[PDB]
Structures are given as C-alpha cells and as structure tokens.
Enzyme design. Structure first.
Site, PDB file in Angstrom:
ATOM      1  N   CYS A  56       0.826  -1.205   0.000  1.00  0.00           N
ATOM      2  CA  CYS A  56       0.000   0.000   0.000  1.00  0.00           C
ATOM      3  C   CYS A  56       0.862   1.258   0.000  1.00  0.00           C
ATOM      4  N   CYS A  93      -2.032   1.635  -2.736  1.00  0.00           N
ATOM      5  CA  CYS A  93      -3.007   2.695  -2.480  1.00  0.00           C
ATOM      6  C   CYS A  93      -2.390   4.082  -2.525  1.00  0.00           C
ATOM      7  N   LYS A  96      -0.960   5.072  -5.820  1.00  0.00           N
ATOM      8  CA  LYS A  96      -2.109   4.923  -6.709  1.00  0.00           C
ATOM      9  C   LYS A  96      -3.070   6.097  -6.566  1.00  0.00           C
ATOM     10  N   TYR A 134      -9.245  -4.144 -10.501  1.00  0.00           N
ATOM     11  CA  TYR A 134      -9.295  -2.744 -10.097  1.00  0.00           C
ATOM     12  C   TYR A 134      -7.928  -2.086 -10.239  1.00  0.00           C
ATOM     13  N   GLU A 137      -7.685   1.169 -12.517  1.00  0.00           N
ATOM     14  CA  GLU A 137      -7.185   2.352 -11.829  1.00  0.00           C
ATOM     15  C   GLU A 137      -5.944   2.906 -12.520  1.00  0.00           C
ATOM     16  N   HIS A 173     -27.620  18.846   2.019  1.00  0.00           N
ATOM     17  CA  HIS A 173     -27.750  19.410   0.691  1.00  0.00           C
ATOM     18  C   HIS A 173     -26.796  20.590   0.520  1.00  0.00           C
ATOM     19  N   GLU A 199     -26.510  12.497  -0.367  1.00  0.00           N
ATOM     20  CA  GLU A 199     -27.879  12.635   0.122  1.00  0.00           C
ATOM     21  C   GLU A 199     -28.876  11.845  -0.715  1.00  0.00           C
TER      22      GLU A 199
HETATM   23  C1  LIG Z   1      -1.674  -1.191  -7.265  1.00  0.00           C
HETATM   24  C2  LIG Z   1      -2.248  -1.691  -5.939  1.00  0.00           C
HETATM   25  C3  LIG Z   1      -3.160  -0.752  -5.432  1.00  0.00           C
HETATM   26  C4  LIG Z   1      -3.819  -0.993  -4.213  1.00  0.00           C
HETATM   27  N1  LIG Z   1      -4.793   0.017  -3.683  1.00  0.00           N
HETATM   28  C5  LIG Z   1      -5.486  -0.217  -2.421  1.00  0.00           C
HETATM   29  C6  LIG Z   1      -6.474   0.809  -1.883  1.00  0.00           C
HETATM   30  O1  LIG Z   1      -6.691   1.804  -2.480  1.00  0.00           O
HETATM   31  N2  LIG Z   1      -7.156   0.560  -0.621  1.00  0.00           N
HETATM   32  C7  LIG Z   1      -6.880  -0.699   0.130  1.00  0.00           C
HETATM   33  O2  LIG Z   1      -7.430  -0.903   1.155  1.00  0.00           O
HETATM   34  N3  LIG Z   1      -5.912  -1.688  -0.410  1.00  0.00           N
HETATM   35  C8  LIG Z   1      -5.228  -1.441  -1.683  1.00  0.00           C
HETATM   36  N4  LIG Z   1      -4.279  -2.426  -2.195  1.00  0.00           N
HETATM   37  C9  LIG Z   1      -4.039  -3.663  -1.414  1.00  0.00           C
HETATM   38  C10 LIG Z   1      -3.130  -3.323  -0.208  1.00  0.00           C
HETATM   39  O3  LIG Z   1      -1.926  -2.840  -0.657  1.00  0.00           O
HETATM   40  C11 LIG Z   1      -2.922  -4.629   0.570  1.00  0.00           C
HETATM   41  O4  LIG Z   1      -4.144  -5.119   0.984  1.00  0.00           O
HETATM   42  C12 LIG Z   1      -2.027  -4.353   1.788  1.00  0.00           C
HETATM   43  O5  LIG Z   1      -0.782  -3.918   1.373  1.00  0.00           O
HETATM   44  C13 LIG Z   1      -1.898  -5.680   2.554  1.00  0.00           C
HETATM   45  O6  LIG Z   1      -1.034  -5.521   3.655  1.00  0.00           O
HETATM   46  P1  LIG Z   1      -0.147  -6.859   4.096  1.00  0.00           P
HETATM   47  O7  LIG Z   1       0.467  -6.604   5.461  1.00  0.00           O
HETATM   48  O8  LIG Z   1      -1.046  -8.079   4.098  1.00  0.00           O
HETATM   49  O9  LIG Z   1       1.012  -7.125   2.947  1.00  0.00           O
HETATM   50  P2  LIG Z   1       2.116  -6.026   2.402  1.00  0.00           P
HETATM   51  O10 LIG Z   1       1.602  -4.609   2.553  1.00  0.00           O
HETATM   52  O11 LIG Z   1       2.373  -6.337   0.937  1.00  0.00           O
HETATM   53  O12 LIG Z   1       3.509  -6.199   3.298  1.00  0.00           O
HETATM   54  C14 LIG Z   1       4.261  -7.348   3.157  1.00  0.00           C
HETATM   55  C15 LIG Z   1       5.754  -6.991   3.467  1.00  0.00           C
HETATM   56  O13 LIG Z   1       6.397  -8.067   3.853  1.00  0.00           O
HETATM   57  C16 LIG Z   1       7.643  -8.218   2.836  1.00  0.00           C
HETATM   58  N5  LIG Z   1       8.126  -9.596   2.811  1.00  0.00           N
HETATM   59  C17 LIG Z   1       7.762 -10.580   1.980  1.00  0.00           C
HETATM   60  N6  LIG Z   1       8.456 -11.677   2.308  1.00  0.00           N
HETATM   61  C18 LIG Z   1       9.252 -11.363   3.341  1.00  0.00           C
HETATM   62  C19 LIG Z   1      10.162 -12.105   4.063  1.00  0.00           C
HETATM   63  N7  LIG Z   1      10.579 -13.512   3.945  1.00  0.00           N
HETATM   64  N8  LIG Z   1      10.830 -11.543   5.058  1.00  0.00           N
HETATM   65  C20 LIG Z   1      10.630 -10.245   5.377  1.00  0.00           C
HETATM   66  N9  LIG Z   1       9.734  -9.513   4.670  1.00  0.00           N
HETATM   67  C21 LIG Z   1       9.051 -10.082   3.653  1.00  0.00           C
HETATM   68  C22 LIG Z   1       7.168  -7.797   1.704  1.00  0.00           C
HETATM   69  O14 LIG Z   1       8.256  -7.485   0.726  1.00  0.00           O
HETATM   70  C23 LIG Z   1       6.423  -6.524   2.167  1.00  0.00           C
HETATM   71  O15 LIG Z   1       7.285  -5.499   2.403  1.00  0.00           O
HETATM   72  C24 LIG Z   1      -3.563  -2.180  -3.496  1.00  0.00           C
HETATM   73  C25 LIG Z   1      -2.647  -3.117  -4.005  1.00  0.00           C
HETATM   74  C26 LIG Z   1      -1.993  -2.873  -5.219  1.00  0.00           C
HETATM   75  C27 LIG Z   1      -0.971  -3.910  -5.788  1.00  0.00           C
HETATM   76  C1  LIG Z   2     -27.010  32.015   1.285  1.00  0.00           C
HETATM   77  C2  LIG Z   2     -27.932  30.903   1.788  1.00  0.00           C
HETATM   78  C3  LIG Z   2     -27.305  29.658   1.628  1.00  0.00           C
HETATM   79  C4  LIG Z   2     -27.963  28.478   2.020  1.00  0.00           C
HETATM   80  N1  LIG Z   2     -27.281  27.154   1.847  1.00  0.00           N
HETATM   81  C5  LIG Z   2     -27.949  25.921   2.249  1.00  0.00           C
HETATM   82  C6  LIG Z   2     -27.257  24.577   2.072  1.00  0.00           C
HETATM   83  O1  LIG Z   2     -26.172  24.517   1.609  1.00  0.00           O
HETATM   84  N2  LIG Z   2     -27.938  23.356   2.477  1.00  0.00           N
HETATM   85  C7  LIG Z   2     -29.308  23.437   3.062  1.00  0.00           C
HETATM   86  O2  LIG Z   2     -29.864  22.448   3.390  1.00  0.00           O
HETATM   87  N3  LIG Z   2     -29.968  24.757   3.226  1.00  0.00           N
HETATM   88  C8  LIG Z   2     -29.282  25.988   2.824  1.00  0.00           C
HETATM   89  N4  LIG Z   2     -29.949  27.276   2.993  1.00  0.00           N
HETATM   90  C9  LIG Z   2     -31.310  27.305   3.580  1.00  0.00           C
HETATM   91  C10 LIG Z   2     -32.328  26.847   2.507  1.00  0.00           C
HETATM   92  O3  LIG Z   2     -32.288  27.705   1.436  1.00  0.00           O
HETATM   93  C11 LIG Z   2     -33.712  26.885   3.168  1.00  0.00           C
HETATM   94  O4  LIG Z   2     -33.724  26.045   4.263  1.00  0.00           O
HETATM   95  C12 LIG Z   2     -34.769  26.435   2.148  1.00  0.00           C
HETATM   96  O5  LIG Z   2     -34.799  27.310   1.077  1.00  0.00           O
HETATM   97  C13 LIG Z   2     -36.122  26.443   2.879  1.00  0.00           C
HETATM   98  O6  LIG Z   2     -37.156  26.100   1.986  1.00  0.00           O
HETATM   99  P1  LIG Z   2     -38.641  26.793   2.276  1.00  0.00           P
HETATM  100  O7  LIG Z   2     -39.682  26.078   1.433  1.00  0.00           O
HETATM  101  O8  LIG Z   2     -38.955  26.706   3.756  1.00  0.00           O
HETATM  102  O9  LIG Z   2     -38.555  28.402   1.902  1.00  0.00           O
HETATM  103  P2  LIG Z   2     -38.043  29.045   0.471  1.00  0.00           P
HETATM  104  O10 LIG Z   2     -37.075  28.117  -0.234  1.00  0.00           O
HETATM  105  O11 LIG Z   2     -37.363  30.366   0.791  1.00  0.00           O
HETATM  106  O12 LIG Z   2     -39.375  29.284  -0.500  1.00  0.00           O
HETATM  107  C14 LIG Z   2     -40.299  30.248  -0.148  1.00  0.00           C
HETATM  108  C15 LIG Z   2     -40.971  30.774  -1.460  1.00  0.00           C
HETATM  109  O13 LIG Z   2     -42.155  31.267  -1.185  1.00  0.00           O
HETATM  110  C16 LIG Z   2     -42.128  32.790  -1.724  1.00  0.00           C
HETATM  111  N5  LIG Z   2     -43.143  33.595  -1.050  1.00  0.00           N
HETATM  112  C17 LIG Z   2     -43.003  34.338   0.055  1.00  0.00           C
HETATM  113  N6  LIG Z   2     -44.183  34.911   0.321  1.00  0.00           N
HETATM  114  C18 LIG Z   2     -45.049  34.521  -0.625  1.00  0.00           C
HETATM  115  C19 LIG Z   2     -46.382  34.808  -0.831  1.00  0.00           C
HETATM  116  N7  LIG Z   2     -47.321  35.651  -0.074  1.00  0.00           N
HETATM  117  N8  LIG Z   2     -47.018  34.280  -1.865  1.00  0.00           N
HETATM  118  C20 LIG Z   2     -46.376  33.458  -2.725  1.00  0.00           C
HETATM  119  N9  LIG Z   2     -45.066  33.173  -2.524  1.00  0.00           N
HETATM  120  C21 LIG Z   2     -44.412  33.711  -1.471  1.00  0.00           C
HETATM  121  C22 LIG Z   2     -40.908  33.172  -1.504  1.00  0.00           C
HETATM  122  O14 LIG Z   2     -40.562  34.405  -2.277  1.00  0.00           O
HETATM  123  C23 LIG Z   2     -40.130  31.935  -2.007  1.00  0.00           C
HETATM  124  O15 LIG Z   2     -40.074  31.900  -3.365  1.00  0.00           O
HETATM  125  C24 LIG Z   2     -29.258  28.545   2.574  1.00  0.00           C
HETATM  126  C25 LIG Z   2     -29.886  29.794   2.729  1.00  0.00           C
HETATM  127  C26 LIG Z   2     -29.226  30.966   2.338  1.00  0.00           C
HETATM  128  C27 LIG Z   2     -29.919  32.357   2.505  1.00  0.00           C
END
Ligand SMILES: Cc1cc2nc3c(=O)[nH]c(=O)nc-3n(C[C@H](O)[C@H](O)[C@H](O)COP(=O)(O)OP(=O)(O)OC[C@H]3O[C@@H](n4cnc5c(N)ncnc54)[C@H](O)[C@@H]3O)c2cc1C
Ligand SMILES: Cc1cc2nc3c(=O)[nH]c(=O)nc-3n(C[C@H](O)[C@H](O)[C@H](O)COP(=O)(O)OP(=O)(O)OC[C@H]3O[C@@H](n4cnc5c(N)ncnc54)[C@H](O)[C@@H]3O)c2cc1C
Ligand SMILES: Nc1cccc2nsnc12
Ligand SMILES: Nc1cccc2nsnc12
Ligand SMILES: [Ca+2]
Ligand SMILES: [Ca+2]
Lengths: 588, 588
Positions: B149, B154, B157, B291, B295, B566, B571
């Site tokens: 790894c 990993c 990679k 994979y 990858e 959101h 979500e």
């Molecule tokens: C390209 C590639 C990408 C991968 N990407 C991921 C990922 O994204 N996420 C994930 O969870 N897993 C990933 N894996 C798998 C991950 O690397 C292995 O699951 C992890 O390394 C296993 O750990 P280990 O201790 O079992 O063996 P290893 O990590 O291989 O360690 C074994 C060590 O013991 C050494 N050794 C061997 N024989 C002897 C000996 N007689 N005496 C002393 N030392 C010895 C070896 O040379 C080595 O250094 C990937 C593998 C590869 C090939």
């Molecule tokens: C800058 C900003 C960023 C935000 N970012 C997030 C986020 O990232 N994630 C998240 O979950 N929430 C976020 N929010 C909050 C989110 O926008 C509100 O929780 C959501 O819009 C609430 O929905 P609502 O139906 O209660 O009201 P609104 O979405 O405001 O809808 C009310 C509608 O009814 C209209 N209305 C008002 N009075 C009348 C009337 N008499 N007659 C007819 N229509 C009317 C209004 O003009 C409006 O169009 C953010 C808010 C702001 C200000």
C-alpha cells in the site's frame, strides 16, 4: 386508534382506493382509473398488520366490508360496479372533480418544501395549486421559481464554493506535475455568474415543466390567506382574486435581515443579491458571522477578492464552538481578514454602482470595536449576513388564527399542523425546526402523503446532519460538545478526536494537523455517539452516511468494528482512540 | 469459559497487570513501572462483568485473590510488595526481560498489517521484532519500509489518481470563470513521480522512527520460519543467523503475477514498477481487468496518455457487474481504449528503455481476439495487472506445519491462528479475507491485543466496504446485486436505484445520468440493506459512513428517515424510491 386514523384518512384524501394486491375487482378499478388519467392513492389492506380491522371499520363509512372501495373527498363513491357505472355513463370525471373548493391543496410559497409538497400531493389525485412570488430586494433583484436554495442559497452558494475550491486545485496541479503557473491565472466573476445563472434558469424551467407534467397549477402571484380555506392572490397586473382550497400549506420561507443603521439598505447588499451580482464585488466587507457570512466570505477570498468579515462576537453561534474556531482560524490563515469584536455604525456612499461598465461602487464603513477603537475603512461592496426572518404579516391576515411565536414563525404540532386545522407550515417558517432544504422537502413530501394517501409517517427532526461549505468544510451530526456536557454533565461525556491530513494534501504541501474530527459520546449509554464533527474536504460527503448510523443509535463500538476504506478522510472515524480526558495530543 | 480465557491471557501476555481503578496498591505498581519505562497491559477487573470470578480464578495462578497481580510471560511475579522488592533490589529489569525467546513477537513482513501488529504489541510490553525485505522486481525496482500500500499500492495509486482528477479540475476551471486554457497545459510525469516518491520516502522514514520510538527492533532482512519459534534471517550482506520468538505473525503480503508468455517478464512491467517509473510510460497497454488495471489505465489516460486495456473477458470479476460495466463505459467514453475479448500471445522488444534520457522503450504486442482476429500493435509500455499471489515457499519451510490452501494462502481460524498454534497470519496471505489495507491493520492490531493484553475482540470481515479509484470512482459495501439474488432468490430482493448528477458537474457541462447508486435489499428481512453501490465523485467518502449503518443492520426505512445534507452526492441515498421491479427509469 385505528378508527381515528381511518376517519382522518377518508376526510382528507382527494381520491383514494382501498384495495388488496391479490384482488381482481380492484385491478379492474385501477386499470379503469389509469386509462381515464385519474390519479389516486391506494392502500392495499393485505399489506397492513391492522388491515382486517380497517376493512371492518370501513363499513362505518361505506356500509360494506369488501374491496375495492373508492372515496372522493370524504365521500364513498362505490364498489367496482358503481365506478364502472359512473365511467360507462361518462359521469366519472365530474364525480372525481366534485369539490367544495377550487383545489384540494393550495401551497403558498414555491420553494424547496412547497414544491416538494405540491408535487407529491398531485401524485395522489389532489388538485393542487402552487403560488410563488419573489418580492424584489431593495436594489430590485428578483428571480424565478424554486425558492431560496435554488436561486439565492445552497445551489449558487455551492457552485461559487466550487469555483473557489478550483483555485486550490489550480495551485495543487503544479505539485502534481501540471505545467501550470497559478500566479498568471485570474478569475472572471461575470463568466462564473453567467454559468451559475444559466443552471438556476434550467431549474426555474425544470420546476415549471414538472408542475405542468403533474397537472399542478402554478400561479406567479402573491398569496394572502384571508380565511382558513380562502387565499387572495395578487398577480403581476395587480389584479386581485380569490381561490379556495381544502388544505393549505404555508411554505413562504424567510428573507435576509438588515441592521438598523443608516446606509445599510441603500448601499449594502445581502446574499439575495450576491449570486446574480452583475459586477465583481471587489474589496468586500461581510458583516455577520453565520454560516452564510463565512461561506460567502470564503469563496470570495478564494476567487482572489480582498475580503474582510466584521464579527460582533463569536463565529457560528449555535454550532460547536471548538469547530467554529477551527473554521475561522483556517479562513484567517487563507486570505480572509477578520475585524473581531466589531459592529457597524453607518454606511456612507463614496461611489454609485456603475451599471454600464459593471463595476462596484465604493463605500465608507464606520463602526467601533469593543475596546473603543474606531473602525473606518473603504469597501467596494458591503454584504450583510446578520440573520434571516419570516414575513408572514404579508401572508397571514391576523384574523385567520394561525399562531406565530415571538420571532414570527408558525407554531406547529409534530405533524406540521398550525392552530388552524386545515393549514400546515413546513420549511424555515416552522418554529423550532432545522432550517435546511432537505428538511423542508422531507416535511412537505411526508405531509402530502399523510393528507392525501393515509400515511402516518412523521418527519424526524432530530440529529439532522449539516455541512458548512466554508473554504475548509465542516460537517456535523448531533450535539455539539458543549451541549452534550450541558445536558448530561462533563463526567458522563467522553470525546474521541484526531487530527488528520487528506492524502491529497501531502504532495500539495498543505497543512498537517488542521483537518480534525471528533465523536462526542455518552459514557453511561454504552458510549452512544451523541455528536459527530469533521473539519476537512468533502465534509458533506463524509458526514452523510454516519447520519444513518447515528439515527440508528450508533455507539463508539459500532464505529470501531466497522472497517475503513483506504485512502479516505472518512476512514479516520473508524480508528479514533485518543480521548480528551486523557490529555493526549490529537495530532499525527 | 472464563477459566479458559484467563489461562490463555496469562500464558500469552509478555507483561500484564491485573488491577482495579479504585485501588491504591495498583497505582503504586503502575507508577513504579512507568518510572522504570516498563510497558505493560492492564486489566481493571472492576470494569468487567465477570471481574470478580476472574479475580477468583486468578488464585489458580497466583494462589491469591487480591490486586495488584503482575505476570511476566506466563509466570506470576508478585503482589505490590514483591514488585517493589525486585525494584529496590534493581532486579526488576532482569525479571521483565526474562524469556525463553529473544522476542515475544517476530513479525515477518513490514507492511500494513505487520507494522500495525508490531507497533500495538510493543505498546503492551511485548519485545517485538519486525522483519521486512523487498525482493526486487525483474527490472530491479525496490523500495523501503511500509509494504505494498505505502510503496506500490493505495498511496501512490491514489496520488496519481488525484493528479488525473486535477486534469478535469483544470477543464472545469474555465466554466467556473478561471482564465485558463486547458489545451495549452501539459503534464510532466517525472515531476509527479518525484513528489509521490518524496511522500513515500517520508512514510518509509516515519515508520522507522515509529518503531524506534516504540522500542521495536527493525531488521531489513529476509525472514524464513524454520521451526515454530525459530526465524532464520538473511541480511543485506547474505549473513545468515537465527532469532527466536514466542508468537509469530506472518504478514508477507503478495506480489504481482506475470502471464506465461514470451517477453512478459523481460519487457513488461507491473504496478510494482509503475509508481517509481523514471520515464513517462507513453503509449501504454494495460493487460488485465482488475481494479488495479482499471485504476492504472484510468489515471494514465487522465494525464494525457494513449492508453489501451486488453480485457480477456469481463471487468472487475467479483464485483457487481452492472457497476463494473458503468465503470468501464465511463472510462471508454473518457479516453481509455479497450481491446475486448482479447488475450496476449507474446511481447517482442523494438526499443530498449533509454536510461539516460528517461524515455520508454518500444514493444510489439501480439495477441488474438475470441473472434479469431489477430491483435498486433506497438506500445511504449506494457503493464501486466493479471492478479497477485503469495510467495510463502520463500518464507515457510514445509516442515513447520503451516497449512496453505491451493492458492498458497494461509488457512486460519477466525482469530488469525494458523495450524501452528503460536503462528498467526494477517493481511493478504490470510485465505478468504478481503485483501485490503484497513483489514490488515485492524486484524493485526486486534490480534496484538488478544495476544498481549487479554482482549477477546475478533476482526469482523463481513460487509467490508471498498472503493475502486477509477476515473469515476465506485464505492461498495455488502453484496452485489447478483450475489444477493443468488443467495435469497430474485423474488426476495428489492433494488432501489437512481442516477444523479453532482452539482459540481452542472456548470462544468458534464454528464447527466452517469453517476448512479443503488440499494440491494431483502424484502423478507424488513427490507434490510444487503448491499450499497455508488458510482460518482468521492465515492470512498460517500460510502464509508454507510458501512457503519450496514454493520448495524440498516434497513431501507433507516435510510429514508435520515435527512439529507444538501447539496451533496451522498444525500441521494436518503430519498431513493424507484425500484428495479417497477421498470421505471432511474434517470433524472
Ligand atoms: C496497485 C495496488 C493498489 C492498491 N490500492 C489499495 C487501496 O486503495 N485501498 C486498500 O485498502 N488496499 C489497496 N491495495 C491492497 C493493499 O496494498 C494490501 O491489501 C495491503 O498492502 C496488505 O497488507 P499486508 O500486510 O497483508 O502485505 P504487504 O503490505 O504487501 O507487506 C508485506 C511486506 O512483507 C515483505 N516480505 C515478503 N516476504 C518477506 C520475508 N521472507 N521476510 C521479510 N519480509 C518479507 C514484503 O516485501 C512486504 O514489504 C492495493 C494493491 C496494489 C498492488
Ligand atoms: C445564502 C444561503 C445559503 C444556504 N445554503 C444551504 C445549504 O447549503 N444546504 C441546506 O440544506 N440549506 C441551505 N440554505 C437554507 C435553505 O435555502 C432553506 O432552508 C430552504 O430554502 C427552505 O425552503 P422553504 O420552502 O422553507 O422556503 P423558500 O425556499 O425560501 O421558499 C419560499 C418561497 O415562497 C415565496 N413567497 C413568500 N411569500 C409569498 C407569498 N405571499 N405568496 C407566494 N409566494 C411567497 C418566496 O418568495 C419563495 O419563493 C441557505 C440559505 C441561504 C440564505
Ligand atoms: N477563531 C476565530 C477566527 C476569526 C474570527 C473570530 N471571531 S471569534 N473567533 C474567531
Ligand atoms: N462495459 C465495458 C467497457 C469496456 C471494456 C469491457 N469488457 S467487458 N465489459 C466492458
Ligand atoms: Ca475499525
Ligand atoms: Ca430522507
């Protein structure tokens, strides 16, 4: 309890069919209705524990215990035969369209919750109208259908966040081998706004199309509830009229507050204006310390802007304050200036906004620090992000009887019902609820199912996860550390934590021991995870999945026995072992 | 059962202290040992349900039922008094260092699992030796401490993956407003490799330092187990010697396979060579469909390389094949060419690798398709990714009695024990286990706690989440759809799914309806989530948290009642509603 549920279901549903899966006459009714394009709810009694008792209580309404049974707006219509009779006699359309009101549902507010509710209600045959009107900002900014998130919130906010993140991707690209000189690259604000507004436009349009495809009436008119069932609408032409609805959903959301100081309304802007601003803000002052203020300050700085945040007292009030400080510390170390313990006194205009060349004006901001020193500095743009507020006086006649709280939000039961029994409130105006788009959507959709499909599932507002999309993102689910200690006592709280470094940051020469995560746990409840907190890249993606586990009552042992995915930031949650009590350092 | 556990704990622990939290004589012993820098395990009996019965069974070993009780390598040392006696008489060091063997633990293999196990064992007083040797690849590639790894998996990679992702960040930057001409930007391979190898070097070094700080002996020598307790080591100087250990952990991992065709070993390379390759591969053929193959092909293409993948039959055998095809389809649509249903016959050399100018050679690859058409094309680099295999004949004398399976992997109990009772196997050589770095780490750490600290917690190998870091990432936790249908029958499986589009992709003009996720659920078990699958950005971050919920037995209802964050990709898992049975399209 069953009888109570059926009485409410029958009274409320617009068009509902009681049926069974293994039923021939039911399918005959279903296929007839489908051909005539009559949408309706269906409840297969054979798939309910209390089905047979419901089938029996049904006779209290229909005088019969057989299926299928078809109801329309509280009235039994008939069994298989009486429906086909109405159909063959081409009397069926008029039957299902018969109502005391113009609509089964009028949604006031075309936002996240209101559109979700209205769309879901029409799915079950409810004749639905969605009213939306966007009162222009002081400078005249307005936008289309979709609400705050779509037009002036999450959507543009996260897109501009993304544009800011690309700044650091451009910096990182060099260390990863790309023949790129970051220092010779500049950002064009208007090009970004054009793309952001093009996407918003596609959403405005997609919503109009969605409502049309679902036979929902969309009215771009200001709605005003004058009696429980009567909504008065004013259209673009100032024309006034009245429509009636059985159920009403208030979903009007909030709008930004201004501070009561001279020049604020006249010369400042809010987030409502920022995301379509036809000119680059330039040297910008953000007044406020909410997640809106810090998110907007954050991406402006990453786009190369000269940005200052004026902070009255603390950052992100209501959030875990350890995490809030780490958020602010990161921003202050990455180009955001902070005028701490400082409030504004007045905004004086030095240059008018240049409409023709798309350039900002120029403003003199006067204020004062807590230590008595005066604040006086020039900014091209001043953004107020000092909270948001409902404006229901513009929507609710005081005479209807919808109880509001001191803050002007609607006081609701745990099923979103107001003090007027046919009127509900969802979204930001619902007092006490997390003010988030997915909450409003879930509330509106689940409410629509209860009203028109007999569902009983309530929205669960507890442990709703959040993410603040600051330059370094902060995701959270559950209690802050201080709230957990407040609620259960310091002695009953264990906090596991660790710094971490994204693998992506290593070759890029970014910071050790800045990204950070912690689990706040309750000792006496099997080390139950009360709160999860992560500061780092893609914090929203990290946090989401853990929200399911927390909903299920995850303990620390549940996190530990889960195996990590390597290499990710999120896997660090599966190997946490340093406690705060131990005093051992969380660094790596 | 308690008596059985205590007998094993006492026999196995190097230095262990039986104690209680609310105990004065215990703390006196603890503080003495700490001052003398004597590490040890501790078991506070007052924090165990069966503590008092253990305190009683202890007398079967110590003839006493009081605490503290201190044992060394199976022998009771004494109560408080006898320890201070040994201390004041400066006989305590020799007591805790007394052993039949040179070491309490010899780890053969300095990889993910072996280093984790060895570090954790020393934490509890076990005198530990870690042996690591890296047999060079055919061309002579070698590397330092850390395993596959860290050095050739990993870590490099995902860093090269990141460099490839930055390609698309550079493309996206324009649409988000950055004054950037992607078409005038090129990638420098050697600059990237330099940074990748610098980070790996910092890990090689960090591991050496970590072992020294924990009093672990590191030997860069080839280890060979000649009897249960005797390891024969050959150092760099070919010098042979023998060390003895009480417990042995085999953690030697695997190495890449070559196909038995002429020219493969001589002229091709594997992943072992790719990540330190001193020259850009150039036009590259990847032979294989694992994979690893996809990858490596993926990031080479994103770096601008002319890349072809030769696929014998299907992609990602053993993974959900719907998801595998979506992975391959995305790559084929984004610059990766595929020679499908094709195998290699021979590699002929046309140019020798240019050592002085760092340029690849040139190779003629001959093969054949299933339809009989010949494959003949020139490539500058040919990468074989056709599986990995253990090489335990180089490590295990057949006479010791460690049972291997047909594939050459070690057959182990669910506590990692081999057929030789003091010898354990962790990581990739452990037959039947997921071959992942966090599995090996958890196995090694938990094993070390059982051997030397009395722990009983086993590693849970079920529902281990994975992520394939292809250009579009694929995260998974639990069963593939086909395996679930195989195991429970099609009628008992419901699959909810949806396409989705990252918000980041909208302004960037990337694809609708390519990212995709599904939940494979069991109808008869309350719609239990048997498998989760997501294709999209940051899929590892998305998937991790859900692995906790699946470990806890998440149902579809658990996903539904959780509220979304959101805007995120993750979500969408909280609002899935289209089933495969319904035939409704998953597009949006
Ligand atoms: C390209 C590639 C990408 C991968 N990407 C991921 C990922 O994204 N996420 C994930 O969870 N897993 C990933 N894996 C798998 C991950 O690397 C292995 O699951 C992890 O390394 C296993 O750990 P280990 O201790 O079992 O063996 P290893 O990590 O291989 O360690 C074994 C060590 O013991 C050494 N050794 C061997 N024989 C002897 C000996 N007689 N005496 C002393 N030392 C010895 C070896 O040379 C080595 O250094 C990937 C593998 C590869 C090939
Ligand atoms: C800058 C900003 C960023 C935000 N970012 C997030 C986020 O990232 N994630 C998240 O979950 N929430 C976020 N929010 C909050 C989110 O926008 C509100 O929780 C959501 O819009 C609430 O929905 P609502 O139906 O209660 O009201 P609104 O979405 O405001 O809808 C009310 C509608 O009814 C209209 N209305 C008002 N009075 C009348 C009337 N008499 N007659 C007819 N229509 C009317 C209004 O003009 C409006 O169009 C953010 C808010 C702001 C200000
Ligand atoms: N930690 C911090 C950084 C920048 C401004 C602040 N106000 S309060 N705490 C802060
Ligand atoms: N869907 C696919 C894309 C590229 C190569 C393949 N072999 S099998 N299925 C494939
Ligand atoms: Ca774990
Ligand atoms: Ca949900």
């Amino acid at each position: 309890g069953t009888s109570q549920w059926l009485r409410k279901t029958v009274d409320s549903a617009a068009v509902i069919l009681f049926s069974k899966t293994t039923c021939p006459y039911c399918k005959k009714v279903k296929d007839v209705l489908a051909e005539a394009k009559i949408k309706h709810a269906t409840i297969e009694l054979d798939q309910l524990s209390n089905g047979s008792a419901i089938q029996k209580c049904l006779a209290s309404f229909s005088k019969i215990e057989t299926v299928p049974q078809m109801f329309v707006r509280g009235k039994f219509i008939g069994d298989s035969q009486t429906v086909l009779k109405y159909y063959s006699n081409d009397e069926l359309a008029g039957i299902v369209n018969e109502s005391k009101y113009d609509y089964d549902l009028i949604v006031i507010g075309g936002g996240s919750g209101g559109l979700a509710a209205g769309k879901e209600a029409a799915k079950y045959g409810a004749k639905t109208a969605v009213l939306d009107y966007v009162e222009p900002t002081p400078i005249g900014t307005t936008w289309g259908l979709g609400g705050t998130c779509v037009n002036v919130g999450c959507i543009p906010k996260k897109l501009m966040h993304q544009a800011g993140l690309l700044s650091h991707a451009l910096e990182d690209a060099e260390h990863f081998g790309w023949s790129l000189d970051r220092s010779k690259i500049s950002h064009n604000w208007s090009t970004m706004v054009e793309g952001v507004q093009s996407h918003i436009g596609s959403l405005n349009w997609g919503y109009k199309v969605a409502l049309r495809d679902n036979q929902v009436t969309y009215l771009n008119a200001k709605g005003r509830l004058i009696s429980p069932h009567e909504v008065q609408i004013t259209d673009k032409n100032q024309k006034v009229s009245t429509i009636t609805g059985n159920k009403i959903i208030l979903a009007t959301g909030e709008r930004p507050k201004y501070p009561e100081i001279p020049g604020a309304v006249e010369y400042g802007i809010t987030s409502d204006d920022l995301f379509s601003l036809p000119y680059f803000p330039g040297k910008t002052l953000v007044i406020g310390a909410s997640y809106v203020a810090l998110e907007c300050a954050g991406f402006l700085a990453s786009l190369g802007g000269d940005v200052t945040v004026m902070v009255r007292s603390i950052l992100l009030r209501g959030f875990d304050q350890q995490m809030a400080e780490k958020v602010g510390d990161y921003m202050e170390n990455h180009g955001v200036k902070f005028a701490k313990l400082c409030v504004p006194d007045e905004i004086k205009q030095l240059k008018v906004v240049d409409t023709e060349n798309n350039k900002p004006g120029l403003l003199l901001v006067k204020g004062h620090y807590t230590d008595g020193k005066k604040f006086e500095e020039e900014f091209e743009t001043v953004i107020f992000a000092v909270g948001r507020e409902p404006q229901l006086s513009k929507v609710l006649c005081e005479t209807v009887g919808v109880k509001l709280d001191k803050n002007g939000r609607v006081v609701c039961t745990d099923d979103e019902q107001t003090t007027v029994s046919n009127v509900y409130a969802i979204g930001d105006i619902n007092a006490g609820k997390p003010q988030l788009t997915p909450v409003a959507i879930q509330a509106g959709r689940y409410l629509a199912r209860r009203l028109f499909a007999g569902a009983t599932e309530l929205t669960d507002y507890s442990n709703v996860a959040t993410t603040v999309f600051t330059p370094l993102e902060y995701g959270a689910c559950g209690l802050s550390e201080e709230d957990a200690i407040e609620k259960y006592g310091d002695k009953d709280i264990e906090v596991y934590h660790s710094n971490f470094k994204p693998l992506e940051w290593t070759v890029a020469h970014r910071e050790d021991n800045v990204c950070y995560m912690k689990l706040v746990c309750r000792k006496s409840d099997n080390m139950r995870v009360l709160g999860l907190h992560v500061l780092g890249p893609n914090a929203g993606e990290i946090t989401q999945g853990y929200a399911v586990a927390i909903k299920m009552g995850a303990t620390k042992a549940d996190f530990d026995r889960t195996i990590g995915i390597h290499p990710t930031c999120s896997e660090t949650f599966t190997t946490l072992h340093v406690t705060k009590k131990s005093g051992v350092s969380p660094i790596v």
